[PDB]
Design a protein around this ligand. Sequence first.
Ligand SMILES: NC(=O)C1=CN([C@@H]2O[C@H](COP(=O)(O)OP(=O)(O)OC[C@H]3O[C@@H](n4cnc5c(N)ncnc54)[C@H](O)[C@@H]3O)[C@@H](O)[C@H]2O)C=CC1
Ligand SMILES: NC(=O)C1=CN([C@@H]2O[C@H](COP(=O)(O)OP(=O)(O)OC[C@H]3O[C@@H](n4cnc5c(N)ncnc54)[C@H](O)[C@@H]3O)[C@@H](O)[C@H]2O)C=CC1
Ligand SMILES: NC(=O)C1=CN([C@@H]2O[C@H](COP(=O)(O)OP(=O)(O)OC[C@H]3O[C@@H](n4cnc5c(N)ncnc54)[C@H](O)[C@@H]3O)[C@@H](O)[C@H]2O)C=CC1
Ligand SMILES: NC(=O)C1=CN([C@@H]2O[C@H](COP(=O)(O)OP(=O)(O)OC[C@H]3O[C@@H](n4cnc5c(N)ncnc54)[C@H](O)[C@@H]3O)[C@@H](O)[C@H]2O)C=CC1
Lengths: 317, 317, 317, 317
Amino acid sequence: APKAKIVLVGSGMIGGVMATLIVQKNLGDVVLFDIVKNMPHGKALDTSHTNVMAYSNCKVSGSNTYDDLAGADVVIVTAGFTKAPGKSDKEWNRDDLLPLNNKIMIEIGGHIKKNCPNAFIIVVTNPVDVMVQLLHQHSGVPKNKIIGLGGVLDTSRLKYYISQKLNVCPRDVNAHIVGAHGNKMVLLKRYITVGGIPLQEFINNKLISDAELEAIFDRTVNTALEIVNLHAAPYVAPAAAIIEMAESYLKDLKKVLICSTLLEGQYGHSDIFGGTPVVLGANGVEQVIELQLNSEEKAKFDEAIAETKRMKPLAHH
Amino acid sequence: APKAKIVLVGSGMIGGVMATLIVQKNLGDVVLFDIVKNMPHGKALDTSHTNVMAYSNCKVSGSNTYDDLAGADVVIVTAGFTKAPGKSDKEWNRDDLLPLNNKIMIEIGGHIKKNCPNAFIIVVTNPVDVMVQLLHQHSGVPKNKIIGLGGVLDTSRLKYYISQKLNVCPRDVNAHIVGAHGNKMVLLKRYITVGGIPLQEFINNKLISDAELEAIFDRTVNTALEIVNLHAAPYVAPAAAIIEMAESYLKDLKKVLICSTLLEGQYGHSDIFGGTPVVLGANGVEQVIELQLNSEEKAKFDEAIAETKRMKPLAHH
Amino acid sequence: APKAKIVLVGSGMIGGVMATLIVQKNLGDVVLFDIVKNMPHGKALDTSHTNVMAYSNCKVSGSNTYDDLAGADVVIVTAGFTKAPGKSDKEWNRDDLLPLNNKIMIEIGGHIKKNCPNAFIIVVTNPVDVMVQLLHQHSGVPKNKIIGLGGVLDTSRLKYYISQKLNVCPRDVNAHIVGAHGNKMVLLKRYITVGGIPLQEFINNKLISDAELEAIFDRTVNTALEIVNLHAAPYVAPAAAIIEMAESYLKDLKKVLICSTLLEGQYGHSDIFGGTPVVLGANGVEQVIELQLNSEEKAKFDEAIAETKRMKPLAHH
Amino acid sequence: APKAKIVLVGSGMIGGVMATLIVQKNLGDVVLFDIVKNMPHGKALDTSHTNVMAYSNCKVSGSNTYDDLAGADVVIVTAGFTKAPGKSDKEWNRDDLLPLNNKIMIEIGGHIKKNCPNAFIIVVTNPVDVMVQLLHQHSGVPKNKIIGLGGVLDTSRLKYYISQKLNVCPRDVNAHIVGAHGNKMVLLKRYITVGGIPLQEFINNKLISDAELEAIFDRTVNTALEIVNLHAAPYVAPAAAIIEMAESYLKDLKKVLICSTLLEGQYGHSDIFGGTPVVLGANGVEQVIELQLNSEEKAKFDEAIAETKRMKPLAHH
Ligand SMILES: NC(=O)C1=CN([C@@H]2O[C@H](COP(=O)(O)OP(=O)(O)OC[C@H]3O[C@@H](n4cnc5c(N)ncnc54)[C@H](O)[C@@H]3O)[C@@H](O)[C@H]2O)C=CC1
Ligand SMILES: NC(=O)C1=CN([C@@H]2O[C@H](COP(=O)(O)OP(=O)(O)OC[C@H]3O[C@@H](n4cnc5c(N)ncnc54)[C@H](O)[C@@H]3O)[C@@H](O)[C@H]2O)C=CC1
Ligand SMILES: NC(=O)C1=CN([C@@H]2O[C@H](COP(=O)(O)OP(=O)(O)OC[C@H]3O[C@@H](n4cnc5c(N)ncnc54)[C@H](O)[C@@H]3O)[C@@H](O)[C@H]2O)C=CC1
Ligand SMILES: NC(=O)C1=CN([C@@H]2O[C@H](COP(=O)(O)OP(=O)(O)OC[C@H]3O[C@@H](n4cnc5c(N)ncnc54)[C@H](O)[C@@H]3O)[C@@H](O)[C@H]2O)C=CC1
């Protein structure tokens, strides 16, 4: 009935574009919560005027008070740091953000548990597969109620780069990147399709070569780094990917979207979060889809999970 | 610059929903042309008021004059009959429409050639793979400028039925039905994916069985018949499929959409139209994608084409 | 959480376009209920495939069982007749539909009371201002939970016709037509704006003359008749207007939309429904806005209400 | 045919959100041009991946080369500075930006004249009513082909603030702010409507008081300042307003939108740009609407224009 209340814990660059897109889509009332005094109110105010241009009617409010999490239907956590200190852009590594963000998850998780234990949570803060589980553990939410951003975004890059080479609608390329959001992300060439057709047929037709695809894979993995090194920050597509996830939940679209979710034996892994296709609908994570990987792909998946696992103890520290 | 002018040659049930959806999408000015006196003006008038609710600004005009094809950017041909005479609903067969519609294509084609030889044409009238080629031949338009409706619609049924069984977003099922739009349409189980994942994995996981899929295939092929026999007429999804095609053209989306197009050696066939994925963009049919079918699938494709071919001489009569 | 369930009581022409638009907009699951055997299932089936083209995920089901009203969040009543018997198109009068539809409202109202007493109801069946109150009285729903279609549709015509003369975006003309949906509808020249600017300025600028506006008023009042007499049936804009209302409710947009609602002293009238701007949001009819009419406009409003009132006793018969 | 090419001259905060919204809306290919090395490529890259989530197909490219203006259909100029040096946020005044941005307009104008003299131009850089005319004069474009941002944005604030007080859909408040975008902007209480109804009726009904409206007017005028002083920057609504303008042009919507345009006697003013409602369509500024202001309102309009005029000679310096 009342619109969904969507609290953006973190009102930085991603938060700002998420607020924008929520109003564009009329998805629900938005709270831009941040620890920075007044900034979220300023961003909220600005954003709120777009209801007029968008023909929407979503309240957009800023907050510097954790208890505004109360009544949240969806909580999207981008709170934290994008860069580590003393580290240059060339040395940008999501792993280095771990010391910086760990303590922030715990605190937010405690606030979510107190204020909106029944909210659907999307964790973004890097290293996301680690931060999401830490938040899961501190917020107390059901495993079907929290996920991390990764695959929707990593695959939008891969999908997009292939679509440009093949000159097809970007969305008509489908692809899977799993395990973790980071330099070990697992790009599954075998699960790439174009217009539902195995990418291998386009390779057989010399429309795109294996070499080009290897360069696209490399680019995909290094995209965040590439953007950081172009004197920009990746936040527009991250926001759009998060909103697509939040939207599938809110409107019960049941889209299959690759997100970081609690693995309970899939791919041989339990007690960790990892990226895999899930179905996001009214009941949250409605299905966790386990790709029937081959042994080579599973080996890569293990390598990705091993990285998340390695940082599990460091996060919890 | 000026909006696209979209002439709907045929202002019956499909025409009406196409006009509706064009205004909803603000795709261009619409002409509802029909041979029935005044009906198209009445439908156009009604439809035109929806600009207000849709926040659009597309003119919608009725026409009983072929020369209103002048300046058309897109021409969508639904002109003809849905049912044959003396034939009951249980005996509904698209082939029987051939005697009834053949002469209508020729005439329209002559008008298109005179009035809008550079228009992009979408032929719908059944039996579509036959009628489209007849129109192609009489209108004189380039082969990259005309297609027939079939696969977008047949696959929306298959996609939809599978998505309901697997509880995923309908659009997340991708599937291919090729050769012809009719009882010989070729359903390619091998090219079905769900969230980009081979349907076989869901079958392996007992999430959907082969038997269920065979029933869904049967239903898909018989859908039009099923609808006709429920005391309804299939026209809403046909319209939406046509609009999705027209939209990809008009907005240069480059979607891969299975349509009836002139085959020039694909699948071993030339000098006939058949359903296959194509990319529809600014330049019309930008790419004709040839699925690398196996011999069994190709045999079915041949059977479908053989039917179109069989009726080629009857149409031209 | 679960999508809204929208039951279309009546699955005829308006019902069909409403189902189409609901899926286009992803507004909720739809039930096409009708007394005609199987037709609604056929229409629902057809419509359901458009989820694919629309990227939506709304179930569309047919029903021939009143109890499928159970759990309805919104009920839209188009059940009834568009034309009276023996009456020609030239003699088409909404009043004549009263004998034909009265008994249908009562029955539906009883089913709504039993099955979905907390649903938001939109009554369309003509003569709507009479049928809506009859349904209100039999369904038992709160006065903030039921309205009739009229002004959104009548004004879309007026708005549209003026926008064409002035060459502005249709939605940029705002206008009010109140009292009743019928030949006594009250067109308030004084409340017409174009881009928020009094229409009188455009008249002063000779951009549109009083005479042209009087012809547009006449056309607006006679539009339904004009469409019927063009061998068409007004149902596309009616559907779009109803969906805009249903949408404002469902998404809590709080749009000001002129609908038939229970008057409780506004304009000097009580215990009757009449068309006036209301605000439709999460709580239904959130505000009933009383235009501060002058005495001349109020006299017309009285004339409109007098007609509804005259038929009140005949309906209840 | 080919999509519109939209060059965003200036790829800062507003530019970034404009690129985002263009892809969301699939409006055309986008070039993010900036003088800052590589930043626009980084932003373009990020933005480009959203085609996937948006189902769009708009190229988004960065540029550090003026000649990428070639072939532009629309040019949106945000190039310049938001704050003056040594000036604190509390002292933020658009006028102070004049020395900083004047030289930038001239240069861009010369590039537009050389590269895309037939492009439709939207100038944003402050003080906009001054910068727009300077660009007009240097680019050589027809007066119907260039406008400045102001009223769509200033009025979205006023509209929004009133809609919150009255609890109606933001877009249902219409209002006019004219003359100039700055502290002398002219808020015309007399032209405010809510759901097409004179705001005075809501004031008469004590739904909003004159005092509240005066506070809302003050807030509206000071909004940019308020946002700057909340540790934020107004750029989301500016972007949305610009896109709504660009969109009306590109899709020939003919929306009435208040923009800065060349006055040729309206309001008694010639040879200057000032904010007034215009109709934006395929042919650019299709109509310049002159509000029939009273003498008090005209006096304010003169005060606003006098400010633009005062800075005319300083800009040209
Ligand atoms: N999972 C994924 O695919 C990716 C994740 N990222 C991670 O997203 C996070 C957000 O990126 P951006 O928005 O660009 O960063 P940002 O630095 O722009 O925004 C983060 C903000 O969170 C704040 N914040 C810090 N502590 C907080 C607390 N306790 N509560 C609320 N707010 C708090 C900040 O003050 C700040 O505004 C980073 O860790 C980045 O690496 C970014 C791209 C995609
Ligand atoms: N290709 C595909 O996947 C399918 C094709 N169809 C074919 O679509 C066609 C249209 O279906 P509906 O709209 O439902 O039929 P309909 O009978 O509602 O509409 C067809 C209309 O075309 C008219 N017409 C006849 N001759 C004409 C001429 N020379 N010029 C202009 N108009 C003319 C009619 O008067 C009429 O209004 C039929 O042949 C149907 O079988 C329908 C569903 C999908
Ligand atoms: N309020 C407004 O502005 C206007 C109201 N109308 C009224 O809308 C109603 C619907 O128009 P259309 O859809 O075009 O008519 P239609 O005749 O196409 O559809 C009406 C249908 O309701 C059915 N029906 C009859 N009794 C029923 C029952 N007990 N339960 C469920 N379904 C039942 C029919 O079988 C039928 O399919 C008519 O009374 C028309 O005058 C139409 C235009 C606007
Ligand atoms: N007209 C209106 O209603 C308002 C106008 N503004 C004016 O909009 C302009 C843009 O605001 P923002 O995007 O926030 O600023 P910003 O500082 O974020 O972006 C401006 C950028 O333009 C650049 N630039 C400078 N010289 C350039 C050149 N020769 N060519 C291309 N790019 C160049 C910058 O490097 C920079 O990235 C400012 O003057 C601001 O005051 C902002 C809000 C609304």
